[PDB]
Symmetry: D2
Subunit: 366 residues, 4 copies
């Protein structure tokens, strides 16, 4: 059994815990051993280690990564801690499952990437929207020739978790200790999807805005320093075009990662708010010609491991169980885990190049 350490218990932390708990239930083999859970404060770590099924909890993440009973470390902490935690786990000889984005800067991601290549350990980054059966089905349909050659990509990622101007300021909204805004939180997810469909990015031209520039801060206010929304025109290395956007102030949207690939022989379209649906157009005889609604079921990758009947909606959290299985397989020397820290660094360059472009008014080439 794989020995597991988990750092953090929040949105992604609990998602990781659920994932590691059921990965063998879904996919077979030996259940991973849930060894050490790290979180703060300590009594929360202890309480949650009990209910999560971990052998023990600790408030010291360094203890978790060095434990001799641990083979792999899930890292779900705030972005500013990612570099230090991943580098320590790799230095301790542990495989790493790091939540996105890799870190605050390209410089940090470059160091992480060299550290991963220096260890002989597997890494995967938590781009969970690449794990849905519908997304994986789309990739396989394209690889099967279902839509011919992609000629255009249009993608967006809209949410409104910051749309309320009275939500408080935080150091996450500074460049120095928050890194990127919408591009860092949501943009990187869209890039992960985008490059899986279209291949590498060659050029971006971007624009960005801070829509709510000031927020409540301990009686007065403080300045929001990173972007609430951004958009970019893409030229892929292949020569094909792309449209790209993200926003954390797009009112009414909650997880609207939506993309489409228009090809020479068809079109694929997806919206994460309805993650069980994949829309596929292929030319057909005029009397019946039209897009097909493909409802997620056992014909799509991964789904059969959770349910034998179609239309029993696959959930957001189950994307994480798939992601866990990919890592287990990679550790065991079968499949590859995508993206590792090398593949991840590329994604980091793209989002930071979009930010640089928006700042400078000039395109950025890769």
């Amino acid at each position: 059994a794989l020995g597991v350490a988990l750092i953090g218990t929040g949105f992604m932390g609990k998602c990781h815990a659920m994932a590691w708990r059921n990965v063998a239930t879904a996919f077979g083999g030996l259940p991973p051993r849930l060894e050490v859970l790290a979180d703060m404060p300590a009594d929360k770590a202890h309480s949650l280690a009990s209910s999560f099924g971990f052998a023990r909890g600790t408030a010291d993440w360094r203890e978790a990564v060095s434990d001799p009973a641990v083979d792999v470390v899930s890292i779900t902490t705030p972005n500013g801690l990612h570099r230090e935690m991943a580098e320590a786990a790799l230095a301790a000889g542990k495989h790493v499952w790091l939540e996105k984005p890799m870190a605050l800067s390209v410089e940090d991601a470059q160091a992480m990437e060299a550290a991963a290549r220096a260890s002989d350990r597997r890494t995967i980054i938590g781009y969970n929207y690449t794990r849905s059966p519908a997304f994986r089905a789309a990739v396989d349909l394209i690889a099967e020739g279902a839509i011919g050659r992609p000629i255009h990509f249009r993608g967006m990622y809209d949410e409104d978790y910051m749309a309320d101007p009275d939500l408080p300021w935080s150091w996450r909204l500074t460049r120095k200790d928050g890194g990127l805004g919408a591009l860092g939180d949501l943009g990187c997810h869209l890039v992960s999807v985008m490059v899986s469909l279209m291949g590498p990015v060659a050029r971006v031209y971007a624009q960005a805005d801070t829509v709510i520039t000031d927020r409540p801060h301990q009686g007065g206010t403080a300045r929001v320093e990173n972007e609430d929304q951004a958009q970019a025109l893409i030229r892929f290395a292949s020569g094909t075009s792309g449209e790209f956007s993200c926003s954390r102030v797009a009112r009414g949207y909650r997880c609207r990662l939506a993309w489409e690939v228009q090809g020479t022989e068809g079109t694929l379209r997806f919206d994460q708010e309805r993650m069980n649906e994949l829309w596929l157009y292929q030319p057909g005889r005029p009397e019946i010609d039209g897009f097909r609604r493909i409802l997620t079921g056992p014909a799509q990758p991964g789904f059969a491991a959770f349910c034998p009947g179609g239309g029993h909606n696959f959930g957001f959290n189950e994307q994480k169980v798939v992601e866990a299985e990919m890592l287990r397989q990679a550790i065991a020397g079968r499949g590859k885990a995508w993206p590792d820290f090398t593949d991840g660094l590329t994604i980091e360059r793209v989002i930071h190049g979009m930010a640089t472009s928006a700042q400078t008014g000039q395109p950025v080439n890769f």
Copy 2:
């Protein structure tokens, strides 16, 4: 910790196993101890015990049910075995989580109901479409007067798992194993939902059909004895009207449990194939008047235990985690499990009453 025995490992067996594994992760407390898994043959039971995380496996279900390390039994076997397994578990002093429908006949269900009442143990039946955040939010909305007084119910449950006439004669067919056809497999679910929204059923007038009358059975052909579809007009105890249907041959549908409640001051509409959407109409100013798409999120019951952010789709399997929690709380005495075997018996009477009506061409009163 509650000691768990699980009988069966198919569609629902694995779903229960996943639910028991993650119930404390989601809702806190102590994780249940996964003690014994029973399945046949023995080889498979030991293999699945290992991957599901159960302390041992056996091919002898009777032994599992009377293991003193077990407190509660999940029963996920075909319908013809429910009665015998449930009565034995209850006789051994074990709580029971029973898959729907209760058994083959109303008489079977009355027996099971009596055994449950005599045992003084908690029961819950696997009507998991009553556990979605959207459904539970709908019930609360109705109670709050969001749509006024209900004036009409229209419900359906379409799937196509038997639509292909080449599918071999399996279990769900005939009177052994399955009992009723679409009414037993799907209709029962629709009733569980319907009565939760509208209250008890006073009268039904029904019709039914067998659309595919024969199937391949190991080189011969065997007759299909139960119904592929059925429809009924309803009068509820309230006086309100209802329409009701189910089908296992409705081509293109996979899990189309869909319902709407029309009221004096609005309308609620839902489709399980998009189980994260609840449609609500309430009167508004003419310029902005229309149905609202309510996307599932932490405002709805149960969701916040799985994810803090709205629009991260809740899945089919997570309904079963919610059901596990309701059973835990009921066992601990902090809540009511619905439906228990008594509540379940009423559901059985409704579906069998519709069968009677379809056979006689006469309405059936309750």
Copy 3:
């Protein structure tokens, strides 16, 4: 060129006026001449005759039906006047485009059916939801075997216009309530898909008993919703409902045909989409959204490019054209007063069934 009389200028009167005005624009041949428009009061009839392009307006409907320049009479008045006006038009030697439902009772419709046969003139009833390109495409798909054998029909017609005074609420002017105003439409579609009805078991309700803003007593005299189970003459099953109090819905005439080899589904609120399921390879399996376009009957007379949405009013231009071709002996219009009589028997049989709590066989 057909000479046209139009009686009534409301919802349907204006729709007929626009249909007659553009039938030749869309389908060729000679533009119909708009001869006489009848409505009350007279000054309204004069005004609308001018703007609609009719040679005259009159407050006397008999004046419209007796005009020698008229070949065909559109009757778009309240239901209580349909019988008298249609019988007079037919006696006068005019073809008749009659709004649904036929009249107030089965007896009325029987008298009208006999009159139509005696007159040797074409009739058509205004069941305009049978005229969409999507609907006509569906009928043809079913005839071609695209969904195999129909095994179940489920239809509904929800609107909410009564949930918030109309002659529709009286038995002398409207007749039946929801069954008469909306039910008949769903019947026209249902029988066109499934064939004739053999049996109904029905139920009904009045939810709003009195119009609360009328001041004086304003008793709603007929049903607000009804539902039925159907057996078709084929033996196949059906579900049927209608409502004028289903809040949020405005023209939700929605139906599906579940076949042994596929399913077709439609909702009039998105009248340009027809959903077709047929089994396919596991990897691509699912319903197709067929967007209305020139491959569908009638569309190409209005637009050569797919996806430019066909409108409700354009259904009426198609209806007019069907009448025009029937008059010229080039096709049969559906439904004539004989086909329409059967539809009346169905909705009135549903009403009887709901009153008695008993099934009604046809």
Copy 4:
């Protein structure tokens, strides 16, 4: 009554003819007199004159624009004839209803705009997607504060009429006698809508592609000179951001002019393939929060002239009737029509500006 001349009888000629015939039926006043129809050859003009209800047909469009019984001229011919015909009509003292785009080039458009200015006759260009009740309702909602201040526009116009590579080459696909491709045929429509919602365009950065570069050309093949698709980032005069695309090779789309306006207090979204629906999000209480589907009815501008009952779908052709009415009222001195040749020249500058941006890889400021 207004005396009408109509030049051309194709897609738009028939659409204009239907509009002229029903404009007084819908909106009152006097029916326009259908005086002269022009098309080639003569047999075709005489036949269509008869069926469209025009007093006469001719093969000589000059005679048509010169007739003293004509007050207004509908020009629905191919793009390379617009300028000559429009200048001739204005010089003959006639009002003009001109199909989009204005001409092949900005220079032609400047010249036509100069002619119009000196004419004292009314002009309107055929931007019919600005005439839907939904679009007009959206514009009014934004003015009323329904979504607060706009903070992002995203628009697209996908069709697939050129997607098949075996469709034969033609001179419209030459820059000389075709002008722009997808920008000229579809892009201009999207600009018309975009500027009406967001205000004037201040800056664009664009890219464009020809996807199918060569098409069967009697015997051999030949070259396509203008673009199949184009995308742009926008800054409006308000400072607000935008995304913009068009394509004539986007498979499965037929008339997918779709746009979205995200504001500080809400979101509006529309797709012309479902032209009777307008989606409006405004913040709501957590239990009922979500987008409203506004179905087109008499509450929206123009609808009541065609039907008194909501939900009876307004069609594409009826947009043209509304456009006819606006011109009618402008001729009567009872309201300015939009867009006239001055307003339209700005739209032409935008689309040609995007083409210039795409060719240079440089932003273009207006």
